[PDB]
Design an enzyme around this catalytic site. Structure first.
Site, mmCIF file in Angstrom:
data_model
loop_
_atom_site.group_PDB
_atom_site.id
_atom_site.type_symbol
_atom_site.label_atom_id
_atom_site.label_comp_id
_atom_site.label_asym_id
_atom_site.label_seq_id
_atom_site.Cartn_x
_atom_site.Cartn_y
_atom_site.Cartn_z
ATOM 1 N N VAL M 58 0.886 -1.418 0.170
ATOM 2 C CA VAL M 58 0.048 0.057 -0.450
ATOM 3 C C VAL M 58 0.940 1.107 -0.078
ATOM 4 O O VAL M 58 0.908 2.278 -0.185
ATOM 5 C CB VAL M 58 -0.876 -0.050 1.692
ATOM 6 C CG1 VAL M 58 -1.706 1.149 1.331
ATOM 7 C CG2 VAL M 58 -2.025 -1.197 0.292
ATOM 8 N N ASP M 59 1.902 1.683 0.736
ATOM 9 C CA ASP M 59 3.044 2.216 1.495
ATOM 10 C C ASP M 59 3.912 2.419 0.490
ATOM 11 O O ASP M 59 4.514 3.397 0.883
ATOM 12 C CB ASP M 59 3.109 2.960 2.629
ATOM 13 C CG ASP M 59 3.931 1.855 3.100
ATOM 14 O OD1 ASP M 59 4.586 0.771 2.472
ATOM 15 O OD2 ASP M 59 4.239 1.648 4.356
ATOM 16 N N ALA M 60 3.713 2.262 -0.898
ATOM 17 C CA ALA M 60 5.538 1.849 -1.453
ATOM 18 C C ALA M 60 5.080 2.900 -2.653
ATOM 19 O O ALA M 60 6.357 3.969 -2.372
ATOM 20 C CB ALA M 60 5.292 0.489 -2.536
#
Lengths: 52, 266, 67, 76, 77, 77, 77, 77, 77, 77, 77, 77, 77, 52
Positions: M58-60
């Site tokens: 998600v937070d890439a």
């Protein structure tokens, strides 16, 4: 600016922080270690009685 | 002391560096531009904390009682089982590297991050008013260089495992076919599957950096921009919260690594 | 703990005191602990796990029904 | 001069978008948390723990932005 | 001078977004608090407790932004 | 000069965002309230009470936004 | 005078934003009303009552905004 | 020149947002009107009545905005 | 000249906002329609009827927005 | 500068908003379609026909803006 | 001259909005696909077919927009 | 000079929109995957497969955008 | 001075959009994680791992954005 | 910020701490853990054989 006073405030904050630490965070860890010790002790003793 | 806080913070944000070419220390206004100018203070604490890790764990490896463990042995074997459970949940191959790699990453990053909870001016006070050196900031992980070194190491390992475990004939196959699977589309996939593979490690590093760097900056600001008698009321509600970060940011760094390696080989 | 009845149209199948149970409701697996909110569902044919207080575990096969 | 207000606007953008993100994310998460608590009211202390875990990630980027915001607001 | 234009503009955009965050963020929460109470209202005092516990976290950043906006509008004029 | 024009612009931004927030928040909350009554009419005495208790917190911030928008428009402009 | 024109942008945004919220805020609410009616159609008026209550809150801030949206474009102008 | 540029931009926003709020607000409401109808088609007309009562409110604050848009283009030039 | 080259931006905003509004509202409405059709297939034509009925109300405003945008592009600018 | 770059910008705005609207609306519709299909693994054609109907409706008004964006791309500029 | 930079700007706008639309639409659609798959795990090859059918349709306009943004950035600018 | 200055804003908007799109789409898809897994723990290895499949599509368009952003930041500079 | 001020706005946009994306995505995912944990407490451990897996995706892109924002704010400064 | 030769100076310290941890830290500890696990489970096996 009074740098020495900024270190004053840093030290006050850190004292309150270590209070919070050693009165909410550490007892969980010590109790977990003690639980592990109790677990292994009881396991080994119960396994001992199986031999007799 | 003629510190306007705007400049005090700027001083706080400067590292202590050395010229690989000229063997000289960096200056508050002067930096040797050439990249070969090692950041020295983080290397000392970094290697210091890796040393303390390996020391504390060998000192129990060579005392390990298989009976009722001592109170100190219990915690080390606890963390060992924690890591082992995570690994054997996410990985299934026969490679013996994964578990110790994960333990190293976990505990090393945890101890590196834990540094920030110390008062911000103390060791910078010592390292200038005793050693006379111009600057000091201590959190090793709060610098892009170290996290990117770890990230590129993990990227090299990812490539190593992806080659070894399914061969170039399969590695090129994954890099060209997925997602749309026809040769007319291979040129497009070759882009995506590349940048994707590049983002995996890079974000891995930056995720660790951005959290810690700003997590340090807050404390700096709190020191530089509030009178003593108030600092605590905004330092404490942050410090406790940061305990929740330094742990997770370590744990995630571990887990994603496994998730990548297991995903690469298998 | 809470009281649990397993009842068929013909005869009763379980009436003990339980600490938690696990079932495969029609919409997915589902675990009931004490104090669970009132709920109604169908359950698919398969096993159900009872743990009697003092932690004694047993498995009952059900041909389906309503929980 | 002309620098200060432009920097204050650059800071206000960060503060506002960070507020948006943190509020909406924790609102969704807390909504699901409360509908979970109303379901298994005896496991509140367990689920709450998980909440505080995942919250620690939702507030990951906002506290970055807020931090840099204060920097721009006071350090330059 | 020109400053006292944007010194207000910024204070608006910060405190307007800080509103959109704080309001909607609580509403999404409050709804789930009601639909739970509307089933078994015997838990109303219990759930309400948890509600505040989590709502304090929601107003973490919005109130920070509101404070900075008030500082920009009044103290910075 | 140009000051009053962008002061009005700032108050406009502030109040538009405040209206967005208050509207959508109270809407999402009232949707669930209107569901609760249907499931258990006869406790309406009660769900409406809790709904007002939550609405106050939902509107706490948009009220400040409107207050300061008016403060600008009719004290500063 | 440039002062003449910027006001129209300050109003047009407000009466735009207050429109997006005040519409959707009701569009959501009315939704939970209809699916409430379709279940217990014997209670339609009673639910309507609560709806007209809750809607009166949703339109609180928007009717302010549109008000000033007029005030700017006609009274300030 | 610019005096007669801005007022057209001021329309683009005013009718644009007013469209969105109108498009979404009904797109939500009618959806439930369909759902409650699909579960019980024998009830279609009564629902079809209540819908138009709610809908008429939703399109209130958007439509006036679009009106003030047309005005701002033509009569305000 | 800018007095005409810049109005293309008003046209673009005016009709793109309508594009998104109409598309998303009709998407929601049609999704509820398709779920209705999936649950009770021997109902399809009546739900289709009501779907067009209120789809007209959905596209009412975006259509005038798009028409005015095209007018502003071709006729005005 | 002031002539053409603004035309490229207007085309970009048109087509970006068209992409938002079309993609999200058809995503919602297709999600409901796949849900219905999984609930009814024999009515796939009977439902996909309705999906094509309502999706033909949906995509259309974005396509207006897309065609006009191409026009501004290669017929104004 | 400065002319070229706003072409980078226009490409940025169009491509970012196209990415938003494509990603969120495919997210919703794939989420519903996985919801369907989880219930009827043997029907995965059928649904995986239907998914792909709609899968290409959501991202038609995003594909067009990204193509034209590449046109603007590399061919024009 | 602006040919140098504004390109960082051009990259900034591309990267921000790519981030929002990728994060939101992957969050929705992963949420549906997690709930499907919670309802069917034995299907975890199967559903996870499909996840990485369908996610491989969702992540397509944003990684174009982000890529070009980097090119704008450092290649064209 | 003249050139090195806009860069801060450029970085602010990156970090703001990245914050919104990461926050809302991780919230949407954690909500389903908590729902699953609520339906089957005993699976909390297993589901938790599947969280940190999917959350890692998600937070890439948000973290890529944050890294480049910090670069612009401290490398170019 | 400043991309620096340290990006290499760290990687060395990395690959070292991995190997000494691998060859000389992990097996020593996991061997003792597995030893205690197996030799607790053998007692359960003994009890089963006693009943059988």
């Amino acid at each position: 600016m009074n740098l020495n006073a900024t270190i004053l405030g840093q030290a006050i904050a850190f004292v309150l922080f270590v209070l919070f630490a050693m009165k909410y965070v550490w007892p969980p860890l010590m109790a977990a270690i003690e639980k592990r010790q109790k677990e292994i002790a009881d396991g080994l003793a119960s396994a001992e009685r199986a031999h007799k | 002391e003629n510190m306007t806080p705007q400049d005090y913070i700027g001083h706080h944000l400067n590292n202590l560096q050395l010229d690989l070419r000229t063997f000289s220390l960096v200056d508050p206004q002067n930096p040797p531009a050439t990249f070969w100018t090692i950041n020295i203070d983080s290397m000392f604490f970094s290697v210091v904390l890796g040393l303390l890790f390996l020391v504390l764990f060998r000192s129990v490896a060579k005392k390990a009682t298989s009976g009722v463990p001592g109170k100190f042995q219990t915690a080390i074997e606890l963390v060992i089982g924690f890591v082992n459970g995570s690994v054997k949940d996410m990985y299934h191959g026969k490679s013996k590297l994964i578990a110790p790699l994960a333990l190293t990453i976990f505990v090393w990053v945890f101890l590196m991050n834990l540094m920030d909870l110390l008062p911000i001016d103390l060791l910078p006070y010592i390292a200038e008013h005793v050693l006379g050196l111009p600057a000091l900031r201590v959190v090793p992980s709060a610098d892009v260089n170290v996290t990117l070194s770890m990230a590129l190491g993990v990227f090299i390992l990812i490539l190593f495992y992806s080659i070894k475990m399914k061969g170039i004939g399969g590695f090129t196959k994954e890099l060209t076919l997925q997602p749309f699977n026809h040769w007319a589309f291979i040129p497009v996939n070759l882009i995506l599957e590349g940048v994707s593979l590049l983002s995996k490690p890079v974000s891995l590093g930056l995720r660790l950096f951005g959290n810690m760097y700003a997590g340090e900056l807050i404390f700096i600001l709190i020191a530089g921009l509030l009178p003593w008698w108030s600092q605590w009321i905004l330092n404490v509600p942050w410090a406790i919260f940061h305990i929740l970060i330094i742990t997770l940011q370590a744990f995630i760094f571990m887990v994603l690594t496994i998730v990548y390696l297991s995903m690469a080989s298998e | 703990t809470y009281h649990l009845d397993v009842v068929s149209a013909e005869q009763q199948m379980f009436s003990g005191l339980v600490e938690k149970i696990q079932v495969t409701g029609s919409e997915g697996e589902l675990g009931i602990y004490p104090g669970h909110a009132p709920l109604l569902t169908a359950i698919k044919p398969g096993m159900i796990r009872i743990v009697k207080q003092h932690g004694h575990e047993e498995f009952i096969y059900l041909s389906g029904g309503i929980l | 001069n002309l620098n200060m207000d432009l920097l204050y606007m650059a800071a206000a953008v960060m503060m506002g978008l960070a507020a948006i993100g943190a509020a909406i994310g924790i609102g969704i998460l807390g909504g699901k948390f409360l509908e979970g608590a109303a379901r298994q009211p005896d496991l509140i202390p367990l689920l709450r723990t998980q909440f505080f875990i995942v919250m620690g990630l939702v507030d990951a980027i906002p506290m970055i932005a807020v931090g840099l915001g204060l920097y721009v607001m006071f350090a330059v």
